[PDB]
Amino acid sequence: TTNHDHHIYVLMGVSGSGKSAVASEVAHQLHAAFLDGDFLHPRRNIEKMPLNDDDRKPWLQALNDAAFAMQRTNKVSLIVCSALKKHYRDLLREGNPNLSFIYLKGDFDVIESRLKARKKTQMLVTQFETLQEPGADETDVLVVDIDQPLEGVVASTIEVIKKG
C-alpha cells in the first residue's frame, strides 16, 4: 500500500539545474532516502546515451516503481528526474498520491554557465523547448529558484519539504 504518512519528492528541471547535487545534500541533512533517477535508465538507454517519449517510457515506469518501493520504509524520499513533460510527471504520479515535485527552476544563462563549468549547448536549448513548466493544474509542484549558491538552493528545498 501507499503510505500517506510518507512522501516522495521528485526533483525536476532541465539538465544543468543541479538536481543531483541538491538532492544528495538535502537527503543527507534530512536523513532521507535518495535515488538519482539517471541510474535507472535501461541498459539500452545507457547504450545510446534529444531522447524521445518511447525512450523515456520504461525509465519512468522504473522510477514510478522505485518511488513506490522507497515510500514503504522512508518518511522522506528524493528522486532526481528531469520530468520535463507533464505526461512524464503524470506517469510518476500513478499510484503515488504521496508524491510531489520540486522544480529546480532557472533561466537559460544560469543553467548554461553551470553546464559550461562541468568536468552540449544545443541540448540545453532543446531541454528548454521540451520543458513544460508545471501550471496551476499541477498542485503538487513546488518551485525553488536555482539562481543562488548551492547552500541556498539546499535550504530552499528543505523549507519546501518541511512547510507541510
* H or E element in which residue 68 lies: helix 53-73
Residue 117 engages a second copy in binding (rule: CB under 8 A): no
Residue 77 assigned as binding residue? no
Residue 93 engages Cl ion in binding (rule: CB under 5 A): no
DSSP string for 90-141: HHHHTT-TTEEEEEEE--HHHHHHHHHH---THHHHHHHHH-----TT-TTE
Residue 39 gets which letter from DSSP? G
Beta carbon of residue 24, minimum distance to a second copy (angstroms, whole number): 7
Pick one of Cl ion, a second copy, none as the site partner of residue 39 (Cβ within 5 to 8 A by kind).
a second copy
Residue 18 assigned as binding residue? yes
Residue 20 assigned as binding residue? yes
Q: Which candidate, 88, 78, 18, 21, places its Cα nearest to that of 51?
A: 88
Residue 135 assigned as binding residue? no
Residue 46 engages a second copy in binding (rule: CB under 8 A): yes
- Cα separation, 73 vs 145, whole angstroms: 30
For a second copy, the closer CB: 25 or 105: 25
Residue numbering of the annotated binding site for ATP: 13-20
Binding site for a second copy (CB under 8 A): 24, 27-28, 33-36, 38-43, 46, 49, 62, 65-66, 68-70, 72
